[PDB]
Design a protein around this ligand. Structure first.
Ligand code: ATP
Ligand code: ATP
Ligand code: MG
Ligand code: MG
Lengths: 255, 255
């Protein structure tokens, strides 16, 4: 293992390549989850990852954060195996959002800013919270952003939780953003604003975004769509292209 | 409160009325969540409940199970205040599904059959699992339906968990079924199958269904739609009716 965790380049393009990737979970090694899995995530694109329940979408998200390593094949980040990047470095360059709980006992400000090397200003905190749809509800609390998450049993609403978790990932400005059904709890207005940010803002134009979703309307807007079935990409392309093909994606839109 | 918890009738139509309902959570009593809230849920209808983040949709679901009581106004079930029904009786007649975890250390069969008065046959267990999309993956395990949930750290996929939780609610055959964003984790095929069950099957035809969702395509199919804003129903009717109305729902659809 001499090259393991050795890389932390100052510049990172965020070009991701899965190359003939297979995977089974270490503690369940005799059930194949990903197999012959090959795709490229290009910076400047939002790539949507879609497919049936259990097809392997969240597993792909896990491998992209080096939470696990491929059992076969290669996961490359700018041409180098992901395992050769420093643990803390990958944390700074790759941010993933799912449906996880917030950090109880810490403030909303802390929750948004958690894990940063720098201390963002309140202007910066408020700016990102306005994008995710978290600013209005936080500003309605008597202690504002200094309000404690989980205070006196208040669990927040699902979409409110999601808006805070999104702001946390957004303010990090990662080279690779992974949204694992991170907007399914957001309302129409909030979902629309987050999408505008990713598709229109200058800062996201150079970054790599993976959008995992069962929502057709989000998939339809992506620059590229990967259809994952039984741990492999059986078809891919734009919405229009996949509709012409009349395969699994078309059948998903029809259903 | 001599009438509190006293009712347990054999015949339950499932007609639900909120009448001028207000609510604040007991530990946060000075933040109003629901206010001037009036609607009816009729048996034989799927009623969709839609609205922005934090509008009070899950709170309504909680009040429908008598997990909390209204601070003002009335929650009637077949004309009688909900507080007047026996705690266990309501458990048998009202089932709610959300994104909650499964029961770890119990089998899949146990998870589906949990809390039932009777012991369902395997034909009955597999039938419901087939409707929710759980049968195929469960049937792939070496001990099948007798496989332990959470075995050796396997937490399943999000959609797989949701399919199990759905099967548990469906097999109870409650008079009132509450789906709190219970199908957003399900793939297209599974979502469609569940909808066919609710809209087409004879058993669900006499039952009351509340479908809480941010997915417009699901709302559009509903027999009635409630648009919740700031804890109050500001408009309601069919999709076509609300589209002709030209208010908040139409704006959401066109957004
Ligand atoms: N246990 C609680 N204690 C105090 N306040 C709560 C609690 N649960 C929810 N709330 C608050 O009540 C309001 C309504 O929340 P609810 O979860 O009902 O909204 P919702 O319409 O389901 O939201 P979303 O669409 O984001 O899921 C929110 O402002 C929320 O923070
Ligand atoms: N920690 C784990 N250990 C063992 N197996 C797992 C683990 N997590 C997921 N799996 C299995 O791997 C397969 C892929 O799961 P994954 O969560 O990647 O699918 P998904 O495409 O995101 O599913 P969904 O659309 O249902 O959310 C499933 O069969 C699942 O049960
Ligand atoms: Mg998943
Ligand atoms: Mg909710």
């Amino acid at each position: 293992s001499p090259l393991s965790g050795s890389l932390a380049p100052l510049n990172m393009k965020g070009l991701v390549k899965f190359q003939d990737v297979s995977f089974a979970y270490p503690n369940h090694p005799n059930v194949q989850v990903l197999q012959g899995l090959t795709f490229t995530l290009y910076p400047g694109k939002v790539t949507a990852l879609v497919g049936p329940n259990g097809s392997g979408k969240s597993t792909v998200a896990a491998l992209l954060q080096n939470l696990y390593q491929p059992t076969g094949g290669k996961v490359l980040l700018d041409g180098e195996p992901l395992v050769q990047y420093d643990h803390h470095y990958l944390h700074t360059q790759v941010a993933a959002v799912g449906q996880e709980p917030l950090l109880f006992g810490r403030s909303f400000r802390e929750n948004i800013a958690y894990g940063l090397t720098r201390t963002p200003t309140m202007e910066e905190i408020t700016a990102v919270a306005m994008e995710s749809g978290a600013h209005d509800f936080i500003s309605g609390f008597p202690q504002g952003y200094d309000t404690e998450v989980g205070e006196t049993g208040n669990q927040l609403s699902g979409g409110q939780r999601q808006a805070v978790a999104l702001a946390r990932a957004l303010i990090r400005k990662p080279r690779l953003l992974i949204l694992d059904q991170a907007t399914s709890a957001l309302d129409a207005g909030n979902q629309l604003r987050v999408q505008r940010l990713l598709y229109e803002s200058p800062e996201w134009a150079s970054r790599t975004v993976l959008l995992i979703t069962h929502q057709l309307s989000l998939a339809e807007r992506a620059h590229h769509i990967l259809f994952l079935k039984e741990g492999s990409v059986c078809e891919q392309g734009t919405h229009l292209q996949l509709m012409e093909r009349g395969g699994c994606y078309r059948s998903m839109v029809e259903a």
